[PDB]
Write an enzyme that holds these catalytic residues in place. Structure first.
Site, PDB file in Angstrom:
ATOM      1  N   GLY B  44      46.629  47.946  32.197  1.00  0.00           N
ATOM      2  CA  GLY B  44      47.398  48.123  30.968  1.00  0.00           C
ATOM      3  C   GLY B  44      46.944  49.308  30.144  1.00  0.00           C
ATOM      4  N   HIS B  47      43.131  50.507  26.865  1.00  0.00           N
ATOM      5  CA  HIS B  47      41.704  50.485  27.252  1.00  0.00           C
ATOM      6  C   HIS B  47      41.178  51.915  27.424  1.00  0.00           C
ATOM      7  CE1 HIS B  47      42.586  46.290  27.921  1.00  0.00           C
ATOM      8  NE2 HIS B  47      43.331  46.543  28.991  1.00  0.00           N
ATOM      9  N   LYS B  95      41.197  45.254  38.608  1.00  0.00           N
ATOM     10  CA  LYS B  95      40.465  44.334  37.682  1.00  0.00           C
ATOM     11  C   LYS B  95      41.049  42.907  37.865  1.00  0.00           C
ATOM     12  CE  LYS B  95      41.675  46.476  33.900  1.00  0.00           C
ATOM     13  NZ  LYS B  95      42.309  47.672  34.545  1.00  0.00           N
ATOM     14  N   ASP B 100      47.443  42.166  37.317  1.00  0.00           N
ATOM     15  CA  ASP B 100      46.897  43.260  38.116  1.00  0.00           C
ATOM     16  C   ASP B 100      46.806  42.795  39.547  1.00  0.00           C
ATOM     17  OD1 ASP B 100      45.838  43.120  35.393  1.00  0.00           O
ATOM     18  OD2 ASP B 100      44.999  45.066  35.738  1.00  0.00           O
ATOM     19  N   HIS B 198      41.641  41.870  26.516  1.00  0.00           N
ATOM     20  CA  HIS B 198      43.031  41.762  26.095  1.00  0.00           C
ATOM     21  C   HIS B 198      43.052  40.849  24.861  1.00  0.00           C
ATOM     22  CE1 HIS B 198      43.560  42.205  30.553  1.00  0.00           C
ATOM     23  NE2 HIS B 198      44.333  43.210  30.135  1.00  0.00           N
TER      24      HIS B 198
END
Lengths: 336, 336
Positions: B44, B47, B95, B100, B198
């Site tokens: 995402g 990060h 990850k 993912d 998250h």
């Protein structure tokens, strides 16, 4: 003492640095480096990595951190300069604030009084407010970092003290910066426009509409506030006296080539800094400015303030070569 | 689109990267690099600099950003892998989060079916919670960066896909992480202990008493939560199927040599990260752990979250040689 812990941590993290005690200052572990001009700066803690993260080859010989938002005392500056003195002079870079000017100036006289050849460069790049709370003239901000790298490269290759000082003073007249804050280190959907790095008030408080609109206002301000004439004193080591020198800045204009620094003042996500850079490139291209190099990240902060600044430094081929020259410090590393 | 503006800014800022469209992903400008295993990851947005700031020689060949906190869709991963394929296979670093895993495993099969030799490495270093909100097992966090660098050096050196994959799975079993948040990207002087990147809940909410006490608790958790047995699937390219593999982690122990990563989750001042590092060094020394190298900065963030994480990765002489190897990326740069 938290500051004591933070400095011990920096020292443990970087074998290339030496943390001294009684008084406290930090130098390159290999200082003094014989035969090169030694470069020093310093200031309040709370702006990390400025200045300790810029100590290393191609940049600072050492730095003198003070307490939070407070200048180091003159004994720290003096002892640091004596530790790094390589026999070719020590050049002190001072951000333009009442406390910094007074302490670095006092240290300069003590150094001279002790036989050390020294001179100064004052940084006053913040175009937002004249005569803020802790400053006579314009505040010294992020362009300080670009100047330390460029003058750091000049000193590293062997330039003379006078040549490094002249370069620093010239770059100072060619670099322009402005910062905004959305929160302190408030209002609600409002920003302090032209904020200072110690939390000083800006031009005004205004509404935050969007990131792009904010960059536009910052950029427009850099263009219209560029012209500036003022006096900056510097130490003439031949006469053993302060010299009042009128200095002139020209506004940025079409045809200029610049180095751009998009700088996080503290809690701005890197994603947003890229969006800022994107809008900045558009505005520079519209205005006829060519961005030749950039730096995007946290380089001159204000604790955890939520905000960012933009700095544009006019350069030429010679300056760009000093930018590309090798630098090896905690915050900046390239062998380009 | 703000996300579009940010990636355009990243592209404009770094001529060494190429931003692709339809679908969107980023690669090294010189990809495909012939004769070397290509390394890819993604995840995402939010990060940054993970993973786009890690694209370059000695690290990622490319990366696939998704929307905020959302995995990139399989088309981005497939097209990115095809773009970087240098004829020696593509290694996917993934990850451990539901999205993912699903999207990267789907891309992996599409790749295999199109003739690309591919395999995978799953990262589950967060020791705080088993089976959080969007993860089956342990969450993949900051150690992902250390693994990208180490496997990146190995690929650059010319190791085979199998060799790079085995090294990544080994490092994954030797790296342990935990993070805390004082504020999201909530209570008064309270912290989310063992927070997810998250914003997933941690072990608990507890009072923040001091920096040193918080580090002590985080460090103690790394020491006691180290033991871990679980299945991690990997793509067997010879059989063309997913292989369930039991993987074992040993706790960190007296005598271990480690790389330490003190990581800003978002809005923690660098001065504080140095305080963290100071306390961490003391605790490692007391527990018989030798920190051989460190990274302190914003490497795997969570928007503007206020907090930080600590990662300790067990290493040996060979791994340290891969650490010391050259890397040239936006976020990490060092030479020989």
């Amino acid at each position: 003492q938290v500051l004591d812990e933070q400095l011990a941590g920096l020292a443990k993290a970087h074998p290339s640095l030496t943390l001294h005690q009684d008084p406290v200052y930090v130098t390159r572990a290999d200082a003094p480096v014989a035969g090169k001009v030694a470069l020093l700066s310093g200031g309040g803690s709370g702006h990390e990595p400025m200045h300790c993260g810029y100590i290393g080859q191609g940049m600072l010989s050492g730095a003198c951190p003070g307490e939070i938002f407070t200048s180091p005392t003159p004994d720290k500056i003096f002892e640091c300069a004596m530790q790094v003195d390589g026999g070719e002079g020590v050049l002190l870079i001072i951000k333009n604030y009442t406390g910094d000017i007074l302490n670095f100036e006092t240290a300069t006289e003590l150094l001279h009084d002790s036989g050390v050849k020294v001179t100064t460069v004052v940084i006053d790049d913040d175009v937002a407010v004249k005569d803020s709370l802790y400053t006579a003239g314009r505040r010294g901000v992020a362009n300080t970092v670009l100047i330390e790298k460029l003058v750091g490269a000049a000193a590293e290759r062997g330039d003379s003290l006078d040549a490094c000082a002249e370069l620093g003073r010239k770059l100072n007249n060619q670099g322009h910066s402005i910062g905004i804050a959305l929160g302190a280190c408030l209002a609600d959907n409002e920003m302090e426009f032209g904020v200072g790095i110690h939390g000083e008030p800006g031009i005004d408080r205004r509404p935050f509409s969007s990131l792009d609109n904010t960059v536009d206002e910052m950029f427009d301000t850099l263009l219209v506030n560029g012209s500036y004439h003022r006096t900056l004193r510097f130490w003439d080591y031949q006469q053993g006296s302060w010299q009042e020198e009128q200095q002139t800045k020209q506004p940025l204009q079409s045809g200029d080539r610049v180095i751009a620094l998009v700088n996080n003042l503290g809690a701005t996500p890197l994603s947003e800094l890229y969006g800022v850079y994107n809008r900045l490139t558009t505005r520079c291209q519209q205005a006829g400015l060519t961005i030749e190099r950039n730096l995007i990240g946290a380089y001159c902060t204000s604790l955890d303030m939520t905000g960012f600044s933009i700095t544009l430094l006019k350069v030429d081929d010679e300056t760009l070569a000093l930018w590309d020259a090798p630098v090896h410090t905690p915050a900046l590393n390239w062998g380009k």
